[PDB]
Amino acid sequence: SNVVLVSGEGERFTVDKKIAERSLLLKNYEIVMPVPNVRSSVLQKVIEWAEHHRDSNFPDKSAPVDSWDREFLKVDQEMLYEIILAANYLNIKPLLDAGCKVVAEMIRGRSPEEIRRTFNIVNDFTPEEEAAIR
């Protein structure tokens, strides 16, 4: 018993109904649900997470990220970003959680410059808002 999920780049993904039901948006109510504005390469990776986790339960500091979830999320930041987006859109809370934990792992321990370099963000503090420091 399958379902098909169409990504935003127009590719069809066939996956098992119960595995797709990991998505609550999916769950809620042959059968072909669209995934608007979600790069086919992104939805792939979601489905991959979902199949890997077919027999995982999760709860409702926190449960640290699964050793597998950590590799599967060792990606470039734009993939990281769209996946977090995707799990938000699809309401796959355990995935949004993991995603967020990894981003937090990027900030952890770092300094302000360190951080900025880590995301290519622009320091737009005035000399006087800069030096304001506690």
Added chain:
Amino acid sequence: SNVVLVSGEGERFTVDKKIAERSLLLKNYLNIVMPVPNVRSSVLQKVIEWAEHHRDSNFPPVDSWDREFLKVDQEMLYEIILAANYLNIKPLLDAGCKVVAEMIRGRSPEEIRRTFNIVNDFTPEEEAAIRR
């Protein structure tokens, strides 16, 4: 749940919404940030100190923590009455008016004048007609 009241000097005062509602203008308004034109910060802060202290008061006679609170110079008192009036907080306005009245009670016209720095501007005629 909070609300911001902006004083005539541009200073933003965060206050609990339930608490600020003591002002019926604010309660009325209407409908996160409410201007309070022409009310100095120190005066607004005084008002909010009153509203926060009376948070659990039932208003429907005289007053007591309000007496230290209203024991200020005349400029301040005046200004607090204006702000109470503007903001529609009857029990505070009522309280400030009572305080003004306490200044006048049992005092002669000579003393009332000296208290408020008022010039006696009756003609000797106006005044003869006054004592009867």
Added chain:
Amino acid sequence: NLKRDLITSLPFEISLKIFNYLQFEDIINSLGVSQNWNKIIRKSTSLWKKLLISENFVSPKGFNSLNLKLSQKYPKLSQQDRLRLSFLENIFILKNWYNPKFVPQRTTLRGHMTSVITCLQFEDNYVITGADDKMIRVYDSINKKFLLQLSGHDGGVWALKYAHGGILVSGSTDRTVRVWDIKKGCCTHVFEGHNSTVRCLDIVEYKNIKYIVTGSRDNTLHVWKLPKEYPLVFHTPEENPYFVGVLRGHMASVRTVSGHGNIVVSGSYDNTLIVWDVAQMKCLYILSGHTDRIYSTIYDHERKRCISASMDTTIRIWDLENGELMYTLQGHTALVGLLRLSDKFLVSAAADGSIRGWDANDYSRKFSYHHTNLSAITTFYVSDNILVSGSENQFNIYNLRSGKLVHANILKDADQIWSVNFKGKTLVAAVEKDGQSFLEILDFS
């Protein structure tokens, strides 16, 4: 320095708030503070209103009448300034009423042929008395003089009601109802129709028409129009254009009546009060439960209540929305005499030389005063400020705010006090000396 004329500086209304927290003594002082305080204080009608009310010189539902009388007395003055002079005058007069050192001016005028006065009216500078000698005597209360005797009744006068314009209505054992003009000095109209003594009477005004309601020992009341435009005699009510109809319901003598507008309440020796609509000529309610004769009633129109006093020794307050009994007041000693309702107090005398006062709204206990002699009360008159009371050899005046006898001394030489009435500076008494009647006018200017 950091000093500011707050009254001046503040919005006008905020300044009146402030001034309305003050005693009037402080307000008089404030008037003398400066032109601007003077103007401010003198601008406010409602400041002076409140003052007049807080000193009980007048009531909310009495005020338009006072305003009118002032515009008449002082036409060149503003409402505010009228109220203020009225306030200042009343305080002066009251201060005198309150001061045990003050001695009023006493005037004595020959009373009636018989030594017992039965009724007394004090209105518009007129004092009117009736008695067992078949005569009504009209006196002038400013100039303090006897104006004139009105004769013609064939029996004793049991009741009289003055109506605006020098008009008088009396009722007599001769079973007539008579209407008088004082200025002209004669009986204008005789209304026959009662089959027995006219015992009591009232005058009511409804939709701008004035009516005489008369109660009789014949069991009935009769309603007549007060004539507007000598004596014209009407032997037949049927053919009398001023005759409205008869009110039948009581099974015995009608002792007492009290009306306002189209509502009239009577009490009877049948132990009952009837409430009547006088425009429909119908009974509204029978009020049952007293167990002996009723001798006094007040229809309380402000509050829509009836107050009755009975030989059974109780007072009852009845609710005129539903004809229901509200309250029974008692007891231990009988009540006597006529009841009075001031704006603050229901007051009655009692069979033990006392006067009692209850709050006029919820009838809680408010005052008792006692003639030290255990002397049967014959008469008292009251207002929110003053109680005046008489009995044998005794004429007392009390300050109802402080609860103290203010004057015990004033009419000592008089043996009996039959009737007493007062308004502002004037106080009048129908009295007996050495087996003879007099009228006493006491003036507290």
Added chain:
Amino acid sequence: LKRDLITSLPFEISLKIFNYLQFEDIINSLGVSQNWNKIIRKSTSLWKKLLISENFVSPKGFNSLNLKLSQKYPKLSQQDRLRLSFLENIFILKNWYNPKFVPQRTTLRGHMTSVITCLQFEDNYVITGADDKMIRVYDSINKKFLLQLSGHDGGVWALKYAHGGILVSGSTDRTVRVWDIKKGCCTHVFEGHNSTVRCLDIVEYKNIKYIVTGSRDNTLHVWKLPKDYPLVFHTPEENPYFVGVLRGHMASVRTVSGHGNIVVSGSYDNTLIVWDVAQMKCLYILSGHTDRIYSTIYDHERKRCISASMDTTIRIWDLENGELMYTLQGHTALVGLLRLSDKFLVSAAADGSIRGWDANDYSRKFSYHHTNLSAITTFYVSDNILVSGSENQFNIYNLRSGKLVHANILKDADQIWSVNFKGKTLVAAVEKDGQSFLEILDFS
């Protein structure tokens, strides 16, 4: 290339990222950008979860800490207030927790006598009382003696501070005095009490305040705290402020605890009674102990009562219905002092033991022994710190790690009569060589 994930993601998600980090990493993040800094301070939850998780306030205590910060930082926003308060708190806690940090010490003269019998610390006042009949008032901000309140005709043995600089005292003269500190004098004397007043409390309820007064005379007295100046009432039936007497215990009332209209007392007669001061009515008889009751706490939050005996146990009772839930074992000696913080029931026995139990289920959370095994004379606790004193020993314990933080800050005391702390201020009434002193310690 890369992305500014924080800015790009919906507010709610970036927030959820921030809730995963430690406070350090969140400050750091404030110094990254106008938008980062913005996002982070738009956030009330962030800082609320932070105060809570370091135990600087409890879900229930929140609104009240909020109003206090409002009363103190009127011109700040809720967020910035919270941030300030967290950052002030984390810096003080680091100090308290730091083995290499030593606090400033101010030693002040105490009472004419070496034993101090009671201590209140509230509103920047330290108030102590002793056998010498006196009450002493100290300023905790400037670390100074303010004034002495005298009047009592005998030892002072119970104090309670009331908001507004008012204090209430119990004594051997059997008076109940009320003082105004800001005026420096006694305002009301409440006689009526046929022995010493050993204990006392103040409660509030339908916005009037009352004083409950407990006695070596078996009964309690209920008065109302008032609204030329030594204004005395010899006569209880003719004293306006006296409500009633609450008769029950057949022995001395050693200890009392209440709020609102519920007061609970524990007696030398081995029982406790639960009272309703509104109706002046006895509610339950907590009976089961086999020796003196030395302490009790009315846990209003959970509608429970805790009792500490000379019989050596502790007992928890359900105040909705009045039966025993648990008997605790942990003291092979009379449990003397009792405290309840948000997370811990802490008790302290005279074998030198101090033990801590979960405030909810009462499972064992910690035990500490003064090395010399002498009687624990006083202790004070929060969720984060334990300060306990005994003869020759003054100890600060870090409750997260269970390690002794300092052992000798008050090395030179021979006795710690009484200890109390708040924020950056530790205060102790101590004895040195026959004289008593007030010790104040500053962790800012």
